[PDB]
């Protein structure tokens, strides 16, 4: 199948709710080389979206029955194996987007844009690897989450306005995850201000029509460092 | 495996939404060789519910998608090679489950409610592949489908309480057929009116543990006779 063929395959699939399917369609269009449309990117970002989506909502249920069993029922050892089974498929999954960002997406991306979302992504499909992880390799799929967002924060904060949606969202997910994830409360608190405080001194060359594309997420910015500045 | 880690690893799949796992698991119970439980055998006909019936969506979807205008020869012939990969998919599953019902299941049965719950899972595997037939296997799909919930309908008349809700379901599933697949209003009524008239005569049949699924049942019988003879 041609990529034309294929990007109509990953349509189809995403109708039918086959996402297995759309996603692989959509790993071939990306194994072409060339940088993607935008449709061609949104097909991609929810093919495995949804596809890693429903490995994560399985390995939790099986994770919270495990928790409630009696310690030497057999019933606790069947959830173990069969939760292994789904953390390897969960695996799999994040390290062919990963393997498809890396080859890929990231390096032929030529705009801006383009390579802070790619970026994010790999920092997202990180995380993800995080949850089911263990032992020393956890704090490894930590640091690679931070830092591939670290390198989409640089390139949004050189590349774009500070009231740019992309920047500011970015700014958001970043400042949280150090919140969180990093346990890094005061810089958290530093990274959310600084990008609420400069795109509040650009607010005056906003258009009137569509200020709202930005001050929402600034919004929740600021919303953020309340909350944790009481804390 | 033990049957009873086969079934725990059912249920664990059935809980995570992997009907997938879930029929594999039931097929290896099955393929033991012995009776199943009513347990086992629910959990069995659950799976391929969920495994068949996410393909007959999915069949359904694209079949919706080919019937609009479309300009484009590529995304047509997509169309057509996406619906024939779904129409394959489908026709493995209920070959899989036919095959169980004929080398296991229904000649292993030593109790007429069994017998009547697999020779109606066959009369709906069956009508499940003649929805994707052509030709004349169109043809022997249809009869196959149609001689098995005769020979489940008439075993459960003589062996079953009529509110019982595997001889309501049955009936409520063979005057579908007769609608849908065969287009005979007229057999369809017929059948459905019979099952609910039998059901509603013999109140006393019913019991508390079975109370909701034979009224559920009774209710679509209603509704579809209603609707049919409108």
């Given at each position: 199948?041609?990529?034309?063929?294929?990007?109509?395959?990953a349509?189809?699939?995403?109708?039918?709710?086959?996402?297995?399917?759309?996603?692989?369609?959509?790993?071939?269009?990306?194994?072409?080389?060339?940088?993607?449309?935008?449709?061609?990117?949104?097909?991609?970002?929810?093919?495995?979206?949804?596809?890693?989506?429903?490995?994560?909502?399985?390995?939790?249920?099986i994770s919270?029955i495990?928790q409630?069993?009696?310690?030497?029922?057999?019933?606790?050892?069947?959830?173990?194996?069969?939760?292994?089974?789904?953390?390897?498929?969960?695996?799999?999954?994040?390290?062919?987007?990963?393997?498809?960002?890396?080859?890929?997406?990231?390096?032929?991306?030529?705009?801006?844009?383009?390579?802070?979302?790619?970026?994010?992504?790999?920092?997202?499909?990180?995380?993800?690897?995080?949850?089911?992880?263990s032992?020393?390799?956890?704090?490894?799929?930590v640091?690679?989450?931070?830092?591939?967002?670290?390198?989409?924060?640089?390139?949004?904060?050189?590349?774009?306005?500070?009231?740019?949606?992309?920047?500011?969202?970015?700014?958001?997910?970043?400042?949280?995850?150090?919140?969180?994830?990093?346990?890094?409360?005061?810089?958290?608190?530093?990274?959310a201000?600084?990008a609420?405080?400069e795109?509040?001194?650009?607010?005056?060359?906003?258009?009137?029509?569509?200020?709202?594309?930005?001050?929402?997420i600034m919004?929740?910015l600021?919303?953020?460092?309340?909350?944790?500045?009481?804390?």
């Amino acid at each position: 199948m041609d990529k034309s063929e294929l990007v109509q395959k990953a349509k189809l699939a995403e109708q039918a709710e086959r996402y297995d399917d759309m996603a692989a369609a959509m790993k071939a269009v990306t194994e072409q080389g060339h940088e993607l449309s935008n449709e061609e990117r949104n097909l991609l970002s929810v093919a495995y979206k949804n596809v890693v989506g429903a490995r994560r909502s399985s390995w939790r249920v099986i994770s919270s029955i495990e928790q409630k069993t009696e310690r030497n029922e057999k019933k606790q050892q069947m959830g173990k194996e069969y939760r292994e089974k789904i953390e390897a498929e969960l695996q799999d999954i994040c390290n062919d987007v990963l393997e498809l960002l890396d080859k890929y997406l990231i390096p032929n991306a030529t705009q801006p844009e383009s390579k802070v979302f790619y970026l994010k992504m790999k920092g997202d499909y990180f995380r993800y690897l995080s949850e089911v992880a263990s032992g020393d390799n956890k704090q490894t799929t930590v640091s690679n989450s931070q830092q591939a967002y670290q390198e989409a924060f640089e390139i949004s904060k050189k590349e774009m306005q500070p009231t740019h949606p992309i920047r500011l969202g970015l700014a958001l997910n970043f400042s949280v995850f150090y919140y969180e994830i990093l346990n890094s409360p005061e810089k958290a608190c530093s990274l959310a201000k600084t990008a609420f405080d400069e795109a509040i001194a650009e607010l005056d060359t906003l258009n009137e029509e569509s200020y709202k594309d930005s001050t929402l997420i600034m919004q929740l910015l600021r919303d953020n460092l309340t909350l944790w500045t009481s804390e």
